[PDB]
Structure formats: C-alpha cells, structure tokens
Amino acid sequence: SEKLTFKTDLEKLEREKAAQIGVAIVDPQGEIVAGHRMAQRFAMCSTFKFPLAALVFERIDSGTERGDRKLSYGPDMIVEWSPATERFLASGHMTVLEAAQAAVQLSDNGATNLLLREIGGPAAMTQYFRKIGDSVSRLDRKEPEMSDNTPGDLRDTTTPIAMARTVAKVLYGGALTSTSTHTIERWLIGNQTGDATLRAGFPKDWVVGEKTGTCANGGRNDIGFFKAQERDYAVAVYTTAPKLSAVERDELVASVGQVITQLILST
Amino acid sequence: EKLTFKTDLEKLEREKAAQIGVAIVDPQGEIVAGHRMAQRFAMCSTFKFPLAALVFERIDSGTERGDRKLSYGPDMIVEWSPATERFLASGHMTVLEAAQAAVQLSDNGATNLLLREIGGPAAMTQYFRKIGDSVSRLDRKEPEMSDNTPGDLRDTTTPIAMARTVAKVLYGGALTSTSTHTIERWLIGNQTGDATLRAGFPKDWVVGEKTGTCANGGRNDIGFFKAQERDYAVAVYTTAPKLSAVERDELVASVGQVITQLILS
Ligand SMILES: *C(=O)[C@H]([C@@H](C)O)[C@@]1(C)CC(S[C@@H]2CN[C@H](C(=O)N(C)C)C2)=C(C(=O)O)N1
Ligand SMILES: *C(=O)[C@H]([C@@H](C)O)[C@@]1(C)CC(S[C@@H]2CN[C@H](C(=O)N(C)C)C2)=C(C(=O)O)N1
Ligand SMILES: [Ca+2]
Ligand SMILES: [Cl-]
Ligand SMILES: [Cl-]
Ligand SMILES: [Cl-]
Ligand SMILES: [Cl-]
Ligand SMILES: [Cl-]
Ligand SMILES: [Cl-]
Ligand SMILES: [Cl-]
C-alpha cells in the first residue's frame, strides 16, 4: 500500500543516514493520514515558536494583549541567534507583533525569550498547549538551553502526532480568528529559515508554510502545513541524526519531504 | 571638524580608488556636512525606501489598501527575490508584504510588483517631485535600473537630494504619524545593512537604513540616525570598481566612522 511504501522508504533513510525520523501528517480535523514514530518523544527546539505565536495571537484576539505594545529590553535579552533583537536593541524595544514575527520567521531566540518573559515563562506555554487539547507538548526552559536535547530528557519535548494535531488546531481547528489565522499562515509561508528543509522536498506548486528547528545532538525539525491537490494537511517532522553534517541534516529533512510527496500523490 | 571630515573622506577615496558622496542633514533638511553632495550617483536599491513611502502615502490617502493581494507568476522572479520566491506558490504578496520585503530584504521581485501597481518608473519620479525632490529620478525597473553605466543620468540621485528626501519622509510630515513610525521601524529592522553604515556608527545610536549594491562597484546606504538626542538624515553613495564586495562593505562602514567623528565633534 502507499502507507507501507511510506514506512519502508523512511526506514531506508533511517538506516542509511543513521537517523531516527518522526513524522505525523493529519487532515484539518486532526485525523491521521500517515506517520512514523508518531508517539516517540523528540525535542521541540525552535519549532515551539509557532505555537508561541498562536498563544500571543489568542491573547490579541481576546483583548488581553495589543500587538503594538512595546516590550522594552536591554543587552541581557540577547542570546545566540538573535538577529532582530540585536538590531532593535538601541531603539530599546520590540513590539509584541514584531517579536512574534521575528521568532517565527527568523527563529530569533531573544525575541522568543522576550515573549516568554511577557506571558509568564515556559509554564504559560505549556498551559496553552493543554488549553488547545495538547496533553503531550511541554515547554520547560527558555532559549537556547531548551534545545540541549539530552537523550531521554523529557523536558521541552513533543511527539509528532501531538504537534501535528496542534498545528491543525491552530490553522484549521478554530483556535484563532479568521484574520489571525490568515496572518499566521502567511508568516509560515514567508519563513526565512526553511528553504533547504521540507519545502525543498515538496513540489513547487504546493502551498507550504513551516517552522524549522535545530537542536544539539543532531536534531533537525520542520513543522507546518501544505496544500496539495485541493487538500489541506498539517505536518510535523522531527529527526535525530548525530553523525550527519548540518547540510546533510537539511538534505535529510528535504528527503522526508520527497517521501511525503510520494505518499500524498499516491493517496 | 569639517576639514577633518573632508580630509578623511579624500584619504579613503585616494587609497581605495573610490568616489564617496555623502550628505548629512538635520530634520528640516539643513546641511550638517557633505562631500560630492551634488554629484549624481546611481540610486540602485536605495530607491526602495522612497517607494515604500509612496505606498504608505497611497494607503494614508485611501487610494491603496495595505492588505490588497497582488497576484503574480514566476515571470516576476528576478535575481535577489527571496520573499517573492517563497510566496510564489501561494500566488500573491500583499501590498504591505511586498513593501516590507523590498525595504528589509531588498527583494527585487517585490519591488517590481509594487512598480507594476503604481504605473512604473514615471509614477515613482512623480512622487519624488511631490515631496520636493526635483533631482532623483527612476527610469527603469529592477534589476536593469542598477546597471550603473558610467555617466548615465538615468536612475540617479544626489546625496543631498536623497538625504533631504529621507528627512522629508521621516521628519517633514510626508506621512501620517503612524505610517512614519512604521517605516522608521522597518529601517531599523532592515536585514541587509549589518556590515555597512551601522557597522561604523556607535552602538547606542538609533539607526535605520536602506542599502544598495550596483554593477560597476556601487555601494550605497541611506537612512537616519539619532545621536546625542538629535536626529539626522544621511545618504551615502560610493563607487569603487576595483574593491571586492567585502571591501566595499568596509568602505561604507569606514564612511560611517568618518561621519561619527564629525557628529561627535
Ligand atoms: C531552534 O531550533 C534554534 C534555537 C534553539 O537556537 C535556532 C534559533 C537555531 C537554528 S539554525 C541557526 C540559525 N541560523 C544559523 C544558520 O543558518 N547558519 C548556518 C549560519 C544557524 C534554527 C533553525 O530554525 O534552523 N533555530
Ligand atoms: C540593490 O541595490 C540591489 C538590486 C539592484 O539587485 C540588491 C537587491 C542586491 C544587493 S546585494 C545582493 C543581495 N544579497 C546578496 C548578499 O548579500 N550575499 C552575500 C550573497 C548580494 C542589495 C543590497 O541592498 O545590498 N540590493
Ligand atoms: Ca509568469
Ligand atoms: Cl523607534
Ligand atoms: Cl482553543
Ligand atoms: Cl532571506
Ligand atoms: Cl560638497
Ligand atoms: Cl556642492
Ligand atoms: Cl495564502
Ligand atoms: Cl537576519
């Protein structure tokens, strides 16, 4: 069957690249299309910044936050991979929406930590996961230490099926207003960090948006959505390949994208 | 201090085989300092900042909508169009998405999408005239407007004309308060200027700018800075055909340092 070919082709990639590949593909209601290691825990790393932006948009939607509110900070906000936070430092602030867009589209760690400071830290992120029906995903630490990805450490983890269903809830399940949903979809399409990962393995006519992550100890992840053959899907891909180079991990996730493509065009 | 400014720029020109045009003006357009300030230079991608101002004026005026979807096909992809490429499958970019990509990524396809909408180079030149700039002129779309053929007056500005245009947009009331603040934040958050002017400015200055890189050694940076609680508009245009690309970045950064010495004096 198409699902057997999907499993077999992912297992080939696992053997040949010394990797473990977690995938979940769901329809807009969260029904499983296909998956692999669906219930295995993986470090979230920067992929949680997409649910973080959804959390922020829900607060704007409910009138408990303003997108143009200025979030002041100083040099101690700057951590590794904080390009926008660095540029705005002299000005003294980033707005709520500026920080959320930098977190999603540049994977800006400082902007992420700026938002975590405002919402009540990792506990508030986890509370949001639980609220939208995700009993699995957990944020325990801020950036960058949440990405240390120690094998077997359950902090800062999700599973592919939990996160795919969280993506579907945000994009298709009514978690956000129509306007906020469309905005976050456009942010995912316009992401600047994913050119070499999943969307490099999907056909060029598919509409794709995603959020990448890179973890210590070989983690490389990509979560988001694709629209193919007049059908919408949510997808979460988590990989661990400790001996691959960084470029080789990009190619690994792109190869997963091609295996997904072969499945969808066979469905 | 003005003699030191001139002398240090001419040392850079001599040692780098370069021409350096600079103008610094106060918020009202009065000259603070300059060098070759009325010599014409190719504007290349720096015109994308006045283009975004024109777009904001039309949104301000009700003749454009910021969320209007601009459809396109792969024909609109030209060199250096990263956002346009990412949004291609979706089939559109909004007016505001395109404008922000033009300013902050120097996206050429997004720039051309906006030029398509306003009626092309003639309308952008008309906007320069409307804001009191009788010098700057757009003749072509991207990337051919950046050909920078020696002596060609097409697609040129002068440092003083463009510095005064920056001041008019940011400080002279060309845009509403809200739109002025937005375009200022876009310039601060620009992704392309880390190695040019702001690399040569002190780190507490609030700086925003728009870069350009042209054929035949053009390297430009225009924008604003707030230093010692005073606001300035600045335009730097340079031509250095024999430098490497990294050395042209270093050249503009060195001009930033010469500017810093003048301001602090
Ligand atoms: C998130 O996964 C990760 C956090 C935990 O640090 C983050 C921000 C790093 C990266 S890759 C990193 C950022 N850009 C650099 C780059 O492209 N190179 C090679 C210079 C490396 C990501 C990511 O999304 O891929 N997120
Ligand atoms: C604008 O001046 C120029 C247009 C006319 O092509 C443009 C878009 C090119 C560049 S530099 C180019 C884009 N990013 C590349 C880069 O930095 N590297 C290292 C590959 C080269 C600019 C610019 O603003 O600097 N604008
Ligand atoms: Ca076409
Ligand atoms: Cl500001
Ligand atoms: Cl909800
Ligand atoms: Cl980019
Ligand atoms: Cl002069
Ligand atoms: Cl003169
Ligand atoms: Cl869309
Ligand atoms: Cl960046």
UniProtKB/Swiss-Prot annotation, chain A:
GO CC, any one term: extracellular region
Reaction it catalyzes: a beta-lactam + H2O = a substituted beta-amino acid
Keyword Disulfide bond: yes
PANTHER family named in the record: BETA-LACTAMASE, BETA-LACTAMASE-TYPE TRANSPEPTIDASE FOLD CONTAINING PROTEIN
UniProt-recorded Gene Ontology molecular function terms: beta-lactamase activity
Consequence recorded when altering E80K: Increases catalytic efficiency about 5-fold, with respect to cefoxitin. Increases catalytic efficiency about 30-fold, with respect to ceftazidime. Decreases catalytic efficiency about 6-fold, with respect to imipenem
Family per record: Belongs to the class-A beta-lactamase family.
Result after altering S147G: Decreases catalytic efficiency about 50-fold, with respect to imipenem. Abolishes hydrolysis of cefoxitin. Increases resistance to ceftazidime about 10-fold, in DH5alpha E.coli strain. Abolishes hydrolysis of imipenem
Pfam families: Beta-lactamase2
Enzyme class: hydrolase
E.C. numbers: 3.5.2.6
Function: Confers resistance to penicillins, cephalosporins and carbapenems. Has carbapenem-hydrolyzing activity.
Subcellular localization, as worded in the UniProt entry: Secreted
UniProt keyword annotations, A-Z: Antibiotic resistance, Disulfide bond, Hydrolase, Plasmid, Secreted, Signal
Annotated binding of imipenem, by residue: S46, S107, N109, T212, T214, R220
Description of how activity is regulated: Inhibited by the beta-lactamase-blocking agents clavulanic acid, sulbactam and tazobactam, via a covalent binding to Ser-46.
Protein name: Beta-lactamase GES-5
Lineage per the UniProt record: Bacteria, Pseudomonadati, Pseudomonadota, Gammaproteobacteria, Enterobacterales
Miscellaneous note of the record: The class A beta-lactamase family has a specific amino-acid numbering system, sometimes called Ambler or ABL numbering and often misspelt as Amber. A multiple sequence alignment was used to derive a consensus sequence and then the consensus was numbered taking into account insertions and deletions. This allows use of identical numbers, e.g. for active site residues, despite differences in protein length. UniProt always uses natural numbering of residues, hence there appear to be differences in numbering between this entry and some papers.
Matches recorded under Gene3D superfamilies: DD-peptidase/beta-lactamase superfamily
Record's keyword annotation contains Disulfide bond: yes
Disulfide-bonded cysteines: C45-C215
InterPro entries in the record: Beta-lactam/transpept-like, Beta-lactam_cat, Beta-lactam_class-A
